[PDB]
Structures are given as structure tokens and as C-alpha cells.
Design a binder for this molecule. Structure first.
Ligand SMILES: Nc1nc2c(ncn2[C@@H]2O[C@H](COP(=O)(O)OP(=O)(O)OP(=O)(O)O)[C@@H](O)[C@H]2O)c(=O)[nH]1
Ligand SMILES: [Mg+2]
Lengths: 173, 293, 1038
């Protein structure tokens, strides 16, 4: 059961860390404590074709807590760009994140995640989210606060990496 | 000049005279297709059908240990539809006064109580868990048998009195009672419930008081006294069990249901109590609790 | 081991650093300290830059070195000694040549190559035109001699193009970018010749593909002439599109060119289109199953389809308007419309979303041409009516296919999400604006458009679909759900009379299907759809009481159904129907002698006896809507009393027992009930509205007593055993009675309609019960919802509560402030809410901020500063909204106005600049600029007092510009006086154009990250200097 390197990027308060925590602990962090640099987090999902491991490189979104920014991406095998539907600014910067990333990783399965769908007053209508189209990225609507489409990003990346369009999570010991 | 769809015949089940719908004497007289007027013959066929082709010993265990690995026909495979349900009492039995019995039911929630592996759970007809808790039923508290000693009860939960009113019993101290005539089942209740330390009282190990529902004869003179009694709860309706019935989950004509008003006009009885059928400004709201402010 | 290697003057090695990097990328917990040291190495400078990149798992270590070098060029380049700059130029160009002429680029990953190239662009950014004049020419010549030194250059240009035209905004100042934009344009022909030459002659694939790629990034800005007045389009279509390993880049280029919003090249577009179509019909035959080609395809045959969606859609949506007028094209257009229909069958949400984007546009474009159906019956002389409008005529048969598409692929309307709330309480949530629901919305809209242009067609499509389920037996749950979803999505799109004929047939046969099908499995799926359909057509129910009656009763029966989901279905429908037919339940219908509600109320228990807790709430909410219809005071009151009779019994019961032993409000079971009773009370209130007051009043006081009982029980438990206790059954249960109590209180005042009566009766008891309780609670025990609950009431009551702000702010303000004044993390909810409250008070009760003493007021305003310094987007924004609003509230009272300016003006100004110059608050950019602009605009007249000591000598406008100039220059001493003076001057000239004001701010944020140095002066005064007065003179001109 081999693993993979997953780089997670986006603006601050996007919910990158919060998203990751939910997966491993099941808990939901209400507080916003910005990540300095990076925090590698191993995640495991059990599929019908053996266990799979993602090394989540939860990077920082803030500019002063940047780190060895573009330096973290090297040797990646898939990525997740994330923005907050409550802040358009975090969607208008997505192009900037996809930029740095592909200049380091020429061809790797990527996913775009619009987080915070649970918050009723959504400032980024779906009609506007079209960036993935011409860059051939996958997209999903997610919420770390409600587990909505919780496992979509990872399920999709698994399909691509294991070259199987029929992989399914099952959670078998 | 309008010809609208017969939505009335839309039905999920083939349950005759279901209590899910109003009496077959209100809607339309001979009602509809999955409704009968003759509860009689079917009763005799079902009681004659009485023999044992089903393994109730193995079922009680599955209920108690949540195991359905597989290893008049079949047993429902989960916590839904384990209760023996009644049809409206239409074909009033000829030998009612000496072969049937009536249990005055309270207003509340029908449930399946399952006490095993040190815990007690109550499910609804729908198999929906409504509460997990500790009880003084054999197998329902943390101080009990981890060696095949479980209990399965058919109850009605009343909120005001925080009491589970035991209506029947299909398994006690690890032994299935399904294969027993209601006659016996009821006796076993009012004989083994009061013989439990404080099963009928509220404590830390037994939050909910389990109280057994009385039953009475269905003789003409008896029904009269029943309809003028006082119960610890507000009356919902009446159940009519045929003394010789085993306990079979789902609908059956061997137990009937009627609301208190329906009795003294379906048989023939008095009608007082239950039959009665369903500077200076202004600031006006007063408190009973009464604390500081 | 520590292995800190900053030791500056130590003749430090490279074999060590080379080890840490390998750990930062491989090891584990070690990487924590590995990253923690390399992030620190960026202190002094980059003398290690040479020794490292020079010395050599090594490229990774060189990449690292490059970042340091990269930073130098973007930071201190301008103040470097000229000779040193040039030293790097050659050091990089050569380093590139070396490794770019390198025999094996890919292994020394394109990563190292790419970063190097990027650094060169980084350098060009800083001098390309002025000090690197021969650059553009040299790289061309170099490309024409070496194929290798050409391929990589095609990458150097692509990066330069992105950095100048695609990502300049924010990272480059406004005027410098224009100078670069020009420089690129003025010398692009030379480079175009190169690309062109390569395309027509170069046999090498990689070089070519990278030239097509560098071309795809050019079509974002290059003068149209190069596209339509050359052979560019012809080259791509004949030469590069037909071959596999180029079909994508080729198409993506064509797509970007097909999206030009111009009206000058009508001819080229026509040929571009018909030329592509030929290639398409040769490549992907018009008779192939595009779905299979996708289902059975890889990351090449799949992208092509997606790119085809984009190309076809983008083009028709733009120049498709002119594909109709011409006649020669009326053939390739049908072929194109055919592709979309095939593509639309691709099982892939993102592709299907693209196609739909077009269809919605088509059916919309033909709806404004004519919203009406064509007059069915032909003319008396047998000819054609012309009833058909000019354009729709061309799409007639394609439209029918699109209707079939919507009816076959209709998306799920509603999205149920089951998730347990922050209590362990399991529930069902309803999404509102997910992408999925948006898909549904668009489908519904397209089919609602098409049904108006020809509803007969729609009904025929749906009748054949429905029949095929019944006996055509293409029967399955998935399809049947889709057909009924589609049917319901068009509700109200027909004439009423047609709808009547439609509905009666549709469900009549579903009512037959449910009988032939055996097993409660199938019958439930069918019954639900029938119940969904009948739920979407209230218009029909409102005209046929008997049917409505029959429906409701059927739902009441289904409410004892034990088959999965049926009970959720039956409740959803019932609340739905009640909402939309509310009036029919409270008024006597023909054939009845008593309003239906009565039957319902005299039977609540027999109906809901088998429902679960939440379903019971949904049921109570449903009847609540009926109650809200009875406008007649007297009767509505009796209805309400009996409506709440069942829940009241439990309440009254629990209450009397609490008036004998208050240890009962500590009982797990009775607390579970108090929760559910309240929850029931909350829903009834949501539907009944104001009139519900008769109920609230009946329990309001005691309910507060128990609330306070629990609130004091919880706080103690915490004070005695720390936060931990909150995380267990009983406490979480007691939290629930509190929260629902608050929901009920705020939930009613919201829909109340007699402010004063509300402020004189239902508000004072809140003080001691909820506020002073919140005060006395231990920090960990205070309910955040208390603040937000109060915020809502201020919004509603407004002026009627302005006199209680003193009493309120006392309890909550200071005590809450001390919970959120240590850092910016702890007690999130308390932060958010607290400021919603402060916002509200300031917004609807400003007078209060004047009543209180200057000492208290100050504490309030400084709290706002505290808000907009937050990194939590929402908290910081609320702070600006408040500050911006507050400034305006001050603009009113002439007297207490000047005082504010004399005391806080500069202080506030300083604080705003404090967060503007911080890289962490870039999302308040607009609000930031707004407030400043307003304050400066105010400076030119308003503030009519002395800010300085002297008096007249310094007009506020002078002291303020100098105060700001001082503050900025003092805070950023690396800036040259010219930089600052320019900035400060733009603050009074751009003071009437927020957008412009913004850019100005964004420019100053660029110059601070860079050491411009008194040396180099590559800014643009005279140019920009006057450019500010072009705006400064628009405020007094028009
Ligand atoms: N309502 C709501 N809030 C969320 C959701 N996801 C995250 N949040 C909140 O938003 C904030 C995001 O915090 P983080 O997960 O640390 O964001 P981040 O992407 O890691 O930020 P950086 O580490 O600086 O890059 C936290 O306060 C979360 O509580 C969500 O799905 N819904
Ligand atoms: Mg993070």
C-alpha cells in the first residue's frame, strides 16, 4: 500500500488546516491559528484495492508566514487549491497559487476546493467559479464544518494516481 | 365537472384494517380494497396455523446481540417491525366475553425495549433508537450477566410519568416467550415485574420506571367498570387480545384496537367518562417557579 | 541536532546544509527542525549563493540557493552596485546557457531550469528595457542558431509574458507595468517572426509544442493584427490540429481566439469556424459515441472533449449570432449544434456544466425573440403561418433534442445533508447554494424557457418518458426520479388549464404504476415521486380542495409507515403544502362544515405518535403556518392555545415539580424534554409570527428562571472541573435548553410588530436573567449566542432600546472584552458576535455612545481598532463597517463632531495605515481605501478646528499631509522622499474615486517591499504627477 505527496495551498483562513484536522481527528477547529511554513500530516483511506496514504503538506496562506514557499512543492504527486466562498479575494488569488504550483509540478492531478458552503451568506456564487475549466482541474463544493463532500477531493485524486476510475473508500481494517 | 385521480387507493402495504388510517366506518363504509369487514375467519386460520416452523430462540439472540449474519413466514432482520400490531376491532368476536381480554393503553410511544450486554435500548416501530440508558431489567444494567441473559419488551413510553408501560413480553431472562399464548405472557408480566428490586422506581441505575399495564375481562359487565376507572395516565385507547395468541410481529386480527368513545357504540355500554369524544399600564404574565428576577 | 549554520564569518561548508534539505523532504518529525532552520537562514544575505549553486540529491539544494538569489533581485537590486547587478546578469544568463544548453534538462528537473528562467524574468522585470537593450534581439538570434537555446527561450518569453500581462497587477506598480507593456508591444514583431518561422519549418516536436504553448499565453494581449491579418489561424487548423500530440494546444489557442469581443474581423471568424469543423468531422466522426470515447479514454482523449466543449460553446455564444445571417454557414452550424448534443451525453459534471451554459443562453436568446408558442392550427389556405419567429426556426429540431436532454439528465433539486450539530444531536440539514443545486437551477431554467416556446413538445417528451416507465419498461428508480424532478421543475410554466390536463394524466398513470409494481421497495419510490409532484403544484391543490384533502390524509397515513425515508418524505411534503395552501386549512371549504385545522388539532397525537423528535418539530411548524392564516384575532387565539396544548402539559408538569425541588432541572430526562419542548416552541413561532406572543408570554418568566438555573449549574460544574466537563451528555444537554431559549427569544422579537410593548415587557426580564447571568458566568461558561441574541433585538427595537444600552453594555461589554484582548485566537464565536452587537448598537442606537463618559466611549472606539486588526476576515471587516459607519454617525451632530476630530482623527488615521501596510489584511483593501478617501475628502472642508498648536499657520490639509508623510516616512525610512510625497499627494487627489484610490494603495504596498534607493530613480513622476490632477480635476468639472 504505497503513498503519495499532497500539497495543500490557498489564502489564509481558507480552512486548509481545519480541513486536514477533521480528517484525522474528526474534530472541528473553531479557532484561527495561522500555520507557520508547513505541517506535514499523513492521512490514510482504505479502498477496495488496498490502503492508501496521503502526505498532506498543509502549507501557509499568509505572506509573512510563507516559508520556503515554492520550495515545498518539489516532488509533489497531486495538489489541492482551496478558497473561501465567503471571500471573493481568495478566489481571485487562486490563479496565483496554481501558477507557482505548476511551474514546479508540470503535470499532477489537482483539485480546486470551495470551502465554507455551510455558511448561508455565500459571497462567491457558483456561476463565477470557472477557473478550473481551461486549466483542466477538478472542482468540488466542500465544508469542513459539515463534512459536505468531505472526501471528494481525496477520492478523485486516488482515482487518478492508482489509474482506477472505480476506486471506492470503504474503511475496512 | 372535474375528474381527479383516485389518490386514496395509493398504499404501501397490504395491511387489512390498518390503524394507520381512520376507522373503516368513517372514510367510506366498505372502505377500500386492503380493508375488510370480516376479521372472524382469518383469526381461526391464524390460530389453527399455530404450530412452530420458526426459530424464535435464535431470533431473540440476534435482537439482543445485533447479529444478522444469516447463518406467517419470516422474521424482520433488524429493529424495525418487531412489535405485534393490531387492526381496528371490526368483526366483534362472538366469544369475546370469555376468550378475549382488554388492556387500557396510555398516551405515549410504542417501543421495542432491548436489554442485553449491560445496556437497555428503546426503538420505535420504525426501528429508530429513541434512548439508550441503564435499567434494572435482566441484562440492562452495568451489573448483570455477560452470559446469555437478555430481555425484550413491547412497551409504551409516557413522557409526563417518565414511565415505560410494559404491554407484553417476548423474551425474559434469556428465554423466548413468542411461543406462548397471550394468556400466559400477561400472567408472567404481572408476576415477574413486581418481583424486581426497584424496577418500578427511579434511581441512578434505573432512571425510567417500568410499570406493567393491567388487563381486564371483556364481559359486558366488566367493560362497564373499566370505562369508569382511574388510571395513572391519560387514556388513549383499548387493546383486545385473544387469550390464545402467540406473539407475531406485524398486523394481526387476533388483537384489536378501539378508541374509548367507540366502545359504547360498537358493543353496548354506559357513556360517562372516556366515551365523551374529543399611572397604570397592562403587563400580564405570572411565574410559578418564582426566583430572584 | 541543532546544526544552526548561520555562523556568518565561519568558513561554512556545504555537505551539511545538503543533509538538512534531504530531511526537509524525506525524514519526518526531523523536518520540523529542518524547515525551522532553512527558513531562518534568510537573515544576513546570500554570500553562500555562489558557493552553493557552484559546489554541486543536489538540485533540490540548488533550488534552495536560487530562492535566496531570487529574493535579492526583487528586494535590493536597485541599490546594488551597478557592476554587481551586471555580475549577476552574466552569472544567470550563463548559468542558464550552461544548464539550458545542457544535454539532459529533464533529469536536472525542468524544476531547476524553470526556476532559473524565472530568475532571469525576475531580472528583466527590473531593467530589461533601459539597461538590457539588446536583450530581445539577442535571444532571437540565439534561437535561430541553436534549437536547444531556442526551445528554452520559448519558455523564457512565456514567463515574461505572464509576469507582465497576466500577473502584473499587485506585484508591479501601475505606471511601471505600462512601461513594460509598451516595451513588449514595441518589440513583439521580431519575436512573432520567430514563432512563425518555427511553426512552418521546425521538425522538432518539443520545440514546436513549447512554441504553440508560448503562443497560447500571447493571445491574451498581442495586437489583433497578428491573429486575423496573418496566416496564424490557417497554420493551426491545417497543420497542428489534426495531429494527436498537438490537438489540445491547437484547440485551446483557437478557443482563446474565438472569444474575441470585437466587430472588426467578421470574415476571418467565418472561415476559422468552417475550417475547424472540417478537421473535427475527420477527427471525431459525427456518428461516434462521445460518451464512450470519454468513459474509455485517458488524460488526452478526455481533455480534448473538454476543450471541444469550451471551443464550441465559447464560439457559438459569441459569433454564433452571425452564423445565422449568412446562408453558406447554415450547414456547419447544424453540425456544430450536433456535437454539443453528443458531448452533452458525457457522464462528467464539469463538461455537462459547460454545454448547459450554452443551451441556457440559446433558449434565452430565443425567448426574447418571442416568448410565445406558435399558433398550432394552420391557415385556411393550407400555407405556413410564419408564426415561427426568424431565428428559432433554425433551431426547431435541435430544441426538441435539448428538451429531451433536460428531461433525461435533470439534476436532484434539493440536497439533504445529515450531520450532527455541536451537541451530538443528529439532524438533517438543507443546503442552499451548493454547486449541485445551481446545476438544478440552470436545468430547470433552460427547460422553463423551452416550455414557453413550445409546451406541447415538453408534455409529449414527458408523456413518452412516463409511458416507457409504465410499460415501455425502461423502468428503474434512477430514471423515474429524474422524470418527476423534471416534471416538477416546470411548475407554473403552463397556462393553468393546460397544467390541469397535464397533472391529472401524469399522476393518474403513476397511480397505476404503483399498483402493478410489487414489493414495498418499488411502491415507496413511486409514492414519493407522486407526493413530490403533487407538492410542486399548489396552484392545482388550491383549486381542488377534495384533492388537497385526500393528499393531506394520505400523508397522515404515510406518517405511520415504517419503510425507510417514507416518514421524512411525508413530512417534507406536508410542511411544503401547508406553507403554500395555508389559507384553505383555516377557512371552511365546500362540502365541509368545519375548518380542516380542527380535525388536525383534535388528532395531533394519533397522527404524530410514531414520528421521531425532529419530524414532530417539522409537523408542528407545518400546522403553525395554517394558524398564521387565521387573521381573525379571537379565533387565532383559541387555535394557538390548543396548538400548544400538548407541549404545554410537559412544561407545566416539569415546572410544578421544579417549584418543590430545583434539583429536578438537573435531571437528564427532564432536561432532554425541556429541550424538545423548546425546540417545538421555536418552530411554531417561526410560522405563527407575532400572534405567537400569547404563548411566549404564558411561559416567558419561568423559562428565564430555568435558563438561569441551568446557566448557573453549568458554570459551577466548569469552575469546579475545568472546560472538560462541557464535553459530556448532561452539560451539552443543558447548553441546549439555553441555546433554544435564546433562539426563541430572538426568533420572536424579530417577527414582532410593536417595538415599545416589546421594550417595556419582554426586555427588562432579560437583563437579570440572561445578561447579568452571562456576566457572572466563568469565562469558559458564558454563552456566545447571548451577544448575538442581543444584537438581533437592537436591530429590531432600535431607538426603543437606546436607553438600555447603559445597563446592557455594563454586563457584557468590558467582561467580554477581557476575553478577547490577549491575542487574536481564543473564543472565536465571542469575537464574531461581540462585534455584531457593537455594530448594531452603533448602527441603531448611536445616541448611547454620547450619553456615556468620554472614558467609556474611548474604550469603545479602541475596541473597534482592535476589530480591524484581526486576521479573521469577518471580524476585521465588521470593524471597518463599524468604523466607517461611526465616522458618518459623527458627521451628524455638529457639536460633538469637532471634538471627535480633535481627539481621534489622527489616532484613527495612523491605525488604518498600520493595517494597510501589513501584508495580512489585503482583503479589506476596498473598505480601507473607502474610509481614508472619506477622511481626506473630509479634510478639505469639514474639520474646522486646529489640529496643531499654532492656529491658522497650518491649515488642516497641510498638517495632515505632513503628519501622514512623517508617519509613513518614519515607519518606512528606506523610501525616498519623492516616493512618499507622491503618495501623500495622491490621497487628496484620488479622494473621489475609490477604485483609483485603491490602486494607489496597492502601489505603495509594492514600493515598501522594495528598497527603491535614492540611487536608481526608475519611477515616473511628471507622468504620474500630472495623471493625478486629471482625476483631481474631475471632482469640480462635471
Ligand atoms: N463556517 C465555517 N468555518 C470554517 C470552515 N472551515 C474552516 N472554518 C473556519 O475558518 C478558519 C480557518 O482556519 P484554518 O483552517 O487554520 O485556515 P488555514 O487555511 O489553515 O489558514 P493558514 O494556515 O494561515 O493558511 C477557522 O476559524 C475555522 O474555524 C467551514 O467549512 N465553515
Ligand atoms: Mg494551515
Amino acid at each position: 500500500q504505497v503513498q503519495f505527496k499532497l500539497v495543500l495551498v490557498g489564502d489564509g483562513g481558507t480552512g486548509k488546516t481545519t480541513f486536514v484536522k477533521r480528517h484525522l481527528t474528526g474534530e472541528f477547529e473553531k479557532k484561527y491559528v495561522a500555520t507557520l511554513g508547513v505541517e506535514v500530516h499523513p492521512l490514510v483511506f482504505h479502498t477496495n484495492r488496498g490502503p492508501i496514504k496521503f502526505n498532506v503538506w498543509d502549507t501557509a496562506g499568509l505572506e509573512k508566514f510563507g516559508g520556503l514557499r515554492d520550495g515545498y512543492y518539489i516532488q509533489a504527486q497531486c495538489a489541492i487549491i482551496m478558497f473561501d466562498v465567503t471571500s471573493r479575494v481568495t478566489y481571485k488569488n487562486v490563479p496565483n497559487w496554481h501558477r507557482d504550483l505548476v511551474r514546479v509540478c508540470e503535470n499532477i492531478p489537482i483539485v480546486l476546493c470551495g470551502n465554507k458552503v455551510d455558511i448561508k451568506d455565500r459571497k462567491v456564487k457558483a456561476k463565477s467559479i470557472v477557473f478550473h475549466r481551461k486549466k483542466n482541474l477538478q472542482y468540488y463544493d466542500i465544508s469542513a464544518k459539515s463534512n459536505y463532500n468531505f472526501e471528494k477531493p481525496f477520492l478523485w485524486l486516488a482515482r487518478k494516481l492508482i489509474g482506477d476510475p472505480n476506486l471506492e473508500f470503504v474503511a475496512m481494517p | 365537472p372535474l375528474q381527479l385521480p383516485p389518490l386514496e387507493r395509493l398504499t404501501l402495504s397490504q395491511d387489512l384494517n390498518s390503524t394507520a388510517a381512520p376507522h373503516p366506518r368513517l372514510s367510506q363504509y366498505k372502505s377500500k380494497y386492503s380493508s375488510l369487514e370480516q376479521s372472524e375467519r382469518r383469526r381461526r386460520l391464524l390460530e389453527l396455523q399455530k404450530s412452530k416452523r420458526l426459530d424464535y430462540v435464535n431470533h431473540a439472540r440476534r435482537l439482543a446481540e445485533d447479529d444478522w449474519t444469516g447463518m406467517v413466514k419470516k422474521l424482520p432482520k433488524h429493529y424495525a417491525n418487531q412489535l405485534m400490531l393490531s387492526e381496528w376491532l371490526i368483526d366483534v368476536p362472538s366469544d369475546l366475553g370469555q376468550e378475549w381480554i382488554v388492556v387500557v393503553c396510555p398516551v405515549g410511544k410504542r417501543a421495542l425495549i432491548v436489554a442485553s450486554r449491560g445496556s437497555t435500548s428503546a426503538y420505535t416501530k420504525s426501528g429508530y433508537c429513541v434512548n439508550r440508558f441503564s435499567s434494572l431489567l435482566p441484562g440492562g444494567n452495568r451489573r448483570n450477566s455477560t452470559a446469555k441473559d437478555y430481555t425484550i419488551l413491547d412497551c409504551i413510553y409516557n413522557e409526563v410519568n417518565q414511565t415505560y408501560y410494559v404491554l407484553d413480553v417476548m423474551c425474559w431472562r434469556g428465554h423466548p416467550f413468542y411461543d406462548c399464548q397471550t394468556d400466559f405472557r400477561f400472567y408472567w408480566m404481572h408476576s415477574k415485574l413486581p418481583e424486581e428490586e426497584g424496577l418500578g422506581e427511579k434511581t441512578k441505575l434505573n432512571p425510567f420506571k417500568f410499570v406493567g399495564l393491567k388487563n381486564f375481562p371483556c364481559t359486558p359487565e366488566s367493560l362497564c367498570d373499566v370505562l369508569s376507572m382511574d388510571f395513572p395516565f391519560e387514556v388513549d385507547g383499548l387493546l383486545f387480545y385473544h387469550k390464545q395468541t402467540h406473539y407475531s410481529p406485524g398486523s394481526t386480527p387476533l388483537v384489536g384496537w378501539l378508541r374509548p368513545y367507540m366502545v359504547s357504540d360498537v358493543l353496548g355500554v354506559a357513556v360517562p367518562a372516556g366515551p365523551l369524544t374529543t399611572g397604570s399600564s397592562h403587563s400580564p404574565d405570572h411565574p410559578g417557579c418564582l426566583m430572584e428576577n | 541536532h541543532a546544526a544552526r549554520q548561520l555562523l556568518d564569518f565561519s568558513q561554512k561548508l556545504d555537505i551539511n546544509l545538503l543533509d538538512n534539505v534531504v530531511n526537509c523532504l524525506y525524514h519526518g518529525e526531523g523536518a520540523q527542525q529542518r524547515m525551522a532552520q532553512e527558513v531562518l537562514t534568510h537573515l544576513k544575505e546570500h554570500p553562500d549563493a555562489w558557493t552553493r549553486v557552484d559546489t554541486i540529491q543536489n538540485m533540490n539544494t540548488k533550488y534552495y540557493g536560487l530562492q535566496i538569489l531570487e529574493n535579492v533581485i526583487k528586494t535590493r537590486w536597485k541599490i546594488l552596485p551597478r557592476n554587481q547587478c551586471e555580475g549577476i546578469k552574466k552569472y544567470v544568463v550563463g548559468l542558464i546557457i550552461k544548464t539550458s544548453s545542457d544535454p539532459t534538462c529533464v533529469e536536472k528537473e525542468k524544476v531547476y531550469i524553470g526556476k532559473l528562467n524565472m530568475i532571469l524574468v525576475q531580472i528583466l522585470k527590473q531593467e530589461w528595457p533601459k539597461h538590457w537593450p539588446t536583450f530581445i534581439s539577442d535571444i532571437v538570434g540565439a534561437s535561430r542558431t541553436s534549437e536547444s537555446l531556442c526551445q528554452n527561450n520559448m519558455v523564457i518569453l512565456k514567463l515574461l509574458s505572464e509576469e507582465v500581462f497576466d500577473f502584473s497587477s499587485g506585484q508591479i506598480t501601475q505606471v511601471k507595468a505600462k512601461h513594460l507593456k509598451d516595451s513588449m508591444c514595441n518589440e513583439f514583431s521580431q519575436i512573432f517572426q520567430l514563432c512563425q518561422f518555427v511553426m512552418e519549418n521546425s521538425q522538432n516536436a518539443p520545440l514546436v509544442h513549447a512554441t504553440l504553448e508560448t503562443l497560447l499565453r500571447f493571445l491574451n494581449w498581442i495586437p489583433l493584427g497578428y491573429i486575423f491579418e496573418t496566416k496564424l489561424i490557417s497554420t493551426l487548423i491545417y497543420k497542428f490540429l489534426n495531429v494527436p500530440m498537438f490537438r489540445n494546444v491547437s484547440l485551446k489557442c483557437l478557443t482563446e481566439i474565438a472569444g474575441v469581443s470585437v466587430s472588426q474581423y467578421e470574415e476571418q471568424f467565418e472561415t476559422l469556424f468552417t475550417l475547424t469543423m472540417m478537421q473535427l468531422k475527420q477527427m471525431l466522426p459525427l456518428n461516434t459515441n462521445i460518451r464512450l470515447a470519454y468513459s474509455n479514454g485517458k488524460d488526452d482523449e478526455q481533455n480534448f472533449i473538454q476543450n471541444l466543449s469550451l471551443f464550441l460553446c465559447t464560439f457559438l455564444k459569441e459569433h454564433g449570432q452571425l452564423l445565422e445571417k449568412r446562408l453558406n454557414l447554415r450547414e456547419a452550424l447544424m453540425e456544430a449544434l450536433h456535437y454539443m448534443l453528443l458531448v452533452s451525453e458525457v457522464e462528467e459534471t464539469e463538461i455537462f456544466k459547460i454545454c448547459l451554459e450554452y443551451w441556457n443562453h440559446l433558449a434565452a436568446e430565443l425567448y426574447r425573440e418571442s416568448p410565445f408558442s406558435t399558433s398550432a392550427s394552420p391557415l385556411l389556405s393550407g400555407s405556413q403561418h410564419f408564426d415561427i419567429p426568424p431565428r428559432r426556426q433554425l433551431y426547431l429540431t435541435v430544441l426538441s433534442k435539448v428538451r429531451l436532454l433536460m428531461v433525461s439528465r435533470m439534476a436532484k433539486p434539493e440536497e439533504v445533508l445529515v450531520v450532527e450539530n455541536d451537541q451530538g444531536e443528529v439532524v438533517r440539514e438543507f443546503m442552499k447554494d451548493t454547486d449541485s443545486i445551481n446545476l438544478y437551477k440552470n436545468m430547470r431554467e433552460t427547460l422553463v424557457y423551452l416550455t414557453h416556446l413550445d409546451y406541447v413538445d415538453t408534455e409529449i417528451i414527458m408523456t413518452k418518458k412516463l409511458q416507457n416507465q409504465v410499460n415501455g419498461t425502461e423502468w428503474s428508480w434512477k430514471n423515474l426520479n429524474t422524470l418527476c424532478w423534471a416534471i416538477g421543475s416546470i411548475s407554473g410554466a403552463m397556462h393553468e388549464e393546460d397544467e390541469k390536463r397535464f397533472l391529472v394524466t401524469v399522476i393518474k398513470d403513476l397511480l397505476g404504476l404503483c399498483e402493478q409494481k410489487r414489493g414495498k421497495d418499488n411502491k415507496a419510490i413511486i409514492a414519493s415521486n407522486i407526493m413530490y409532484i403533487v407538492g410542486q403544484y399548489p396552484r392545482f391543490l388550491r383549486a381542488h380542495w377534495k384533492f388537497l384533502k385526500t393528499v393531506v390524509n394520505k400523508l397522515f397515513e404515510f406518517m405511520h409507515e415504517t419503510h425507510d425515508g417514507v416518514q421524512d418524505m411525508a413530512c417534507d411534503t406536508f410542511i411544503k403544502i401547508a406553507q403554500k395552501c395555508r389559507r384553505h386549512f383555516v377557512q371552511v371549504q365546500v362540502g365541509e362544515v368545519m375548518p380542516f385545522i380542527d380535525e388536525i388539532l383534535n388528532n395531533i397525537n394519533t397522527i404524530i405518535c410514531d414520528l421521531q423528535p425532529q419530524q414532530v418539530h417539522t409537523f408542528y411548524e407545518a400546522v403553525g403556518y395554517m394558524i398564521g392564516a387565521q387573521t381573525d384575532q379571537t379565533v387565532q387565539e383559541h387555535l394557538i392555545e390548543k396548538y400548544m396544548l400538548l407541549p404545554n402539559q410537559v412544561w407545566d408538569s416539569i415546572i410544578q415539580q421544579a417549584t418543590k425541588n430545583v434539583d429536578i432541572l438537573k435531571d437528564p430526562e427532564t432536561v432532554k424534554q425541556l429541550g424538545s419542548i423548546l425546540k417545538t416552541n421555536v418552530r411554531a413561532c417561526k410560522a405563527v409570527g407575532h400572534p405567537f406572543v400569547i404563548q411566549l408570554g404564558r411561559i416567558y418568566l419561568d423559562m428565564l428562571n430555568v435558563y438561569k438555573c441551568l446557566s448557573e449549574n453549568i458554570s459551577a460544574a466548569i469552575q469546579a472541573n475545568g472546560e472538560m466537563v462541557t464535553k459530556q451528555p448532561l452539560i451539552r444537554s443543558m447548553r441546549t435548553v439555553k441555546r433554544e431559549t435564546l433562539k426563541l427569544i430572538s426568533g420572536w422579537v424579530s417577527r414582532s410588530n410593536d417595538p415599545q410593548m416589546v421594550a417595556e415587557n419582554f426586555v427588562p426580564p432579560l437583563l437579570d436573567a440572561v445578561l447579568i447571568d452571562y456576566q457572572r458566568n466563568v469565562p469558559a461558561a458564558r454563552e456566545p449566542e447571548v451577544l448575538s441574541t442581543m444584537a438581533i433585538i437592537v436591530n429590531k427595537l432600535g431607538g426603543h432600546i437606546t436607553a438600555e444600552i447603559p445597563q446592557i453594555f455594563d454586563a457584557v461589554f468590558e467582561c467580554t472584552l477581557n476575553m478577547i484582548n490577549k491575542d487574536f485566537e481564543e473564543y472565536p464565536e465571542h469575537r464574531t458576535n461581540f462585534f455584531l452587537l457593537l455594530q448594531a448598537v452603533n448602527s441603531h442606537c448611536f445616541p448611547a455612545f454620547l450619553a456615556i463618559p468620554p472614558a467609556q466611549f474611548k474604550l469603545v472606539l479602541d475596541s473597534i481598532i482592535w476589530a480591524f486588526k484581526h486576521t479573521m476576515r469577518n471580524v476585521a471587516d465588521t470593524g471597518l463597517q463599524i468604523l466607517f459607519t461611526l465616522l458618518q454617525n459623527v458627521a451628524q451632530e455638529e457639536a460633538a463632531a469637532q471634538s471627535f476630530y480633535q481627539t481621534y482623527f489622527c489616532d484613527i488615521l495612523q491605525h488604518i495605515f498600520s493595517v494597510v501596510t501589513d501584508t495580512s489584511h489585503t482583503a479589506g483593501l476596498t473598505m480601507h481605501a473607502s474610509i481614508l478617501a472619506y477622511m481626506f475628502n473630509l479634510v478639505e472642508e469639514g474639520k474646522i478646528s486646529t489640529p496643531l498648536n499654532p492656529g491658522n499657520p497650518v491649515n488642516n490639509q497641510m498638517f495632515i499631509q505632513d503628519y501622514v508623510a512623517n508617519l509613513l516616512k518614519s515607519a518606512f525610512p528606506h523610501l525616498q522622499d519623492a516616493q512618499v510625497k507622491l503618495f501623500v499627494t495622491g490621497l487628496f487627489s484620488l479622494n473621489q474615486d475609490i477604485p483609483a484610490f485603491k490602486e494607489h494603495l496597492r502601489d505603495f504596498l509594492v514600493q515598501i517591499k522594495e528598497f527603491a534607493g535614492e540611487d536608481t530613480s526608475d519611477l515616473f513622476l511628471e507622468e504620474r504627477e500630472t495623471a493625478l490632477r486629471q482625476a483631481q480635476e474631475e471632482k469640480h468639472k462635471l
